[model samples]
Target chain A: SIPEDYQARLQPNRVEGSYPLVRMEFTGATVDAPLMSQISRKYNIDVSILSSDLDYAGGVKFGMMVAELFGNEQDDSAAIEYLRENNVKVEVLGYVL
Target chain B: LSIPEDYQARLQPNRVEGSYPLVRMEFTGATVDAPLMSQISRKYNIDVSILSSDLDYAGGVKFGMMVAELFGNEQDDSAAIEYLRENNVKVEVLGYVL
Candidate 1:
């Protein structure tokens, strides 16, 4: 359990004009995948790229990309399901105003 | 445990000199007596940044989770990770920054 002091800062904001935010992490050899475009086009949602890294070698490749999947109810679910089906690791962090 | 799916694709058998590996980690229901980020930084001799964090208090109980970034080389990172395991802190390797 977290301490009382720290917990106060991490609460999900429930004020007006707030939107749900989902944080996603993807790790692979290369960052060339088009998962973001696919989600944006198919689900018609905006995917915010949070962070990206590309570590490649002659005989190996490594990459990890973080993104946020957000939108209304329908769009959010569609993006999540698509990522799951494609085996992308994702987490629904919280909501942001 | 085995490397996460697609995680293997991001690694090279050889190590790069003068390069630090950055890892993304998440902690849930972590105790605050010893902060995970501070502990990791102190024990592992690495720099850490809190990307996101939240605390939930309800029913008179307290617990929460946070996301963090750890910076270190592969060799040093192994020891730090072991320390986390010994302490029973849930740490996930989201990705490595070369």
Candidate 2:
């Protein structure tokens, strides 16, 4: 994020409101992707995992667990038996049930 | 350390509830603390369902119904300005979207 007054030094577009949308001066992760990708053909919901360290093994195991859960939800036993018939298989995860 | 949680109040009370009466708001924030997404919604009964960030433009200028819902936080102008005054964040309102 750049300071408001810093624009005064710009070679051009230095006029007030020339660059309208500026990130506010802040220090934490702003979950801004979901908004940025929300559009007709570019709609997306971003999930950010903020961790201090990466554990490749843990990540692989988590992926495997989620994969199975994701598959089961699409089985014929569910109400939307033919959901796969269309082209939508949305998988969502959270910490709690 | 670029962002001072206390600096939010300096931005001025530029936000209004909405252009029309259709936008009744649940305002809650302070010069000392601009509420985060989850906290603000949970405490003030603000709906998080349609939440979105303002980020639309060639250089990444975005704003709309969804963005406003996400970034908007209700607070008293005087209190926020005062908080900014105590701190060192300069306050100004530009027609731009950030």
Give the candidate number with the greatest TM-score: 1
* lDDT assessment of candidate 1: 0.49
Check candidate 1 and list the clashing pairs. A2-B63, A10-B54, A10-B55, A29-B9, A61-B9, A61-B10, A62-B10
Worst 10 residues of 2 chain A by lDDT: A61-70
| Tens-place lDDT digits, model 1, residues B17-58 | 653443434333343233334345545555543333343444
lDDT of candidate 2 over B1-98, digit per residue (tens):
12122232232334444411111122212122222222233333233222212222122221111112232244432343334344433333321122
Clashes of each: 7, 9
Per-candidate Cα lDDT values, in order, are: 0.49, 0.23
Off by over 4 Å in 1: A1-16, A28-33, A54-63, B1-98
Candidate 2 stretches with Cα past 4 Å from truth are A1-97, B1-13, B16-36, B48-98
Compute each candidate's TM-score over C-alphas: 0.37, 0.20
Q: What is the interface RMSD of candidate 2, in Å?
A: 14.6
TM-score of the B chain in model 1?
A: 0.56
Query: In model 2, how well does chain A match by TM-score?
Result: 0.18
The window of 10 residues in a row where model 1 chain B has the poorest summed lDDT is B26-35
Error of 1 at B27 (Å): 30
